[PDB]
Design a protein around this ligand. Structure first.
Ligand SMILES: CC(C)CN(C[C@@H](O)[C@H](Cc1ccccc1)NC(=O)O[C@H]1CO[C@H]2OCC[C@H]21)S(=O)(=O)c1ccc(N)cc1
Lengths: 99, 99
């Protein structure tokens, strides 16, 4: 669909059999989710944001569905203020910016 | 135009009579620009994200031109690692997400 930006672009996503609300974030290279129980092996990693760096759990080849669009990519799990959907996932669902 | 998400959506902006590269960021409520000596009054503010918070200076009713699209609104100035164009400006230039 076309999504205007007068509100936060929040969407219901499905990961690990759970539904969650996430923010479509064209300023994030990577997708970062709040603390959660995800099945599958993971590797430690660090990501930095506007305020510094945090510790995350990196899950590769994770199934994600966004508004009926399926993705399979890396998901970082850690103390992010918000579930954010980064470009690694947004490209898989064919998301573009237009003005 | 249409901008894909394979790479960071960097564009040229014009503010305070200066040209700069900024990130079109649907995940940002407000525009936040690298440290620059803007004139006029301002109010302190703190914005938070991954890594915590940074303190910024909020100027209101600032003219920004994004690839020819004119906008006027709030602009936050502070030690951000990247120039960020937020929804407050993305709405004024008619930007949308599409997938
Ligand atoms: C986390 C979001 C809810 C909000 N952020 C915008 C977001 O797009 C930042 C914007 C951003 C981009 C680069 C550097 C710092 C901040 N990107 C980000 O944190 O992505 C991280 C995950 O993937 C990596 O890619 C970039 C950083 C990593 S934010 O920078 O902290 C922010 C908060 C408030 C305002 N008014 C403006 C921006």
């Amino acid at each position: 669909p076309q999504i205007t930006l007068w509100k936060r672009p929040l969407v219901t996503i499905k990961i690990g059999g759970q539904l969650k609300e996430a923010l479509l974030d064209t300023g994030a290279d990577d997708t970062v989710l709040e603390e959660m129980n995800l099945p599958g092996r993971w590797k430690p990693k660090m990501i930095g944001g506007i305020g510094g760096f945090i510790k995350v759990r990196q899950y590769d080849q994770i199934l994600i569905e966004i508004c009926g669009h399926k993705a399979i990519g890396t998901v970082l799990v850690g103390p992010t203020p918000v579930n954010i959907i980064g470009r690694n996932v947004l490209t898989q669902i064919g998301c573009t910016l237009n003005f």
